[PDB]
Design a binder for this molecule. Structure first.
Ligand SMILES: [Mg+2]
Ligand SMILES: [Mg+2]
Length: 155
């Protein structure tokens, strides 16, 4: 076995677009790290991605990760852009840039460090840690301090 870690993530947004935030918990050997940050203008989907990126980027060795989230958006890109069909050159069928590619590329880079088991949670009652990530993300959205510099009204 490698170092075994559990990651829980969620993102939230008060508008579409509007102030949003992410929350993540990383747990290894009974010790816990929490990550959260709030953005003045973003989307729910970008916050769900950022939560997974930040937690994975915090790992400093090759780990076996169990990554638990309720994000359907995160699942879509795992199935479409970030593992399968990277042959498409980061283009759609009509040869166009994919939405949120800045974050999808950071997620792809972070995932390549680890063995990953996904736990796609059915909404809530998955774990208290998922509920805690939802609280972290909403708390940050209510107190935004950064710009989401990669969010454009147009990409
Ligand atoms: Mg959400
Ligand atoms: Mg949420």
């Amino acid at each position: 076995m490698l170092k075994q870690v559990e990651i829980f993530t969620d993102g939230s947004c008060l508008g579409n677009p509007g102030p949003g935030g992410y929350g993540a918990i990383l747990r290894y050997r009974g010790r816990e790290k929490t990550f959260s940050a709030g953005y003045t203008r973003t989307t729910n989907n970008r916050m769900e991605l950022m939560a997974a990126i930040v937690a994975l980027e915090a790992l400093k060795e090759h780990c076996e990760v169990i990554l638990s989230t309720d994000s359907q958006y995160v699942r879509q890109g795992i199935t479409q852009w970030i593992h399968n069909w990277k042959k498409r050159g980061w283009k759609t069928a009509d040869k166009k840039p994919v939405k949120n590619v800045d974050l999808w590329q950071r997620l792809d880079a972070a995932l390549g460090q680890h063995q990953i088991k996904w736990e796609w949670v059915k909404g809530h009652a998955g774990h208290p840690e998922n509920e805690r990530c939802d609280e972290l993300a909403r708390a940050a959205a209510m107190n935004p301090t950064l710009e989401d510099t990669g969010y454009q009204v147009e990409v």
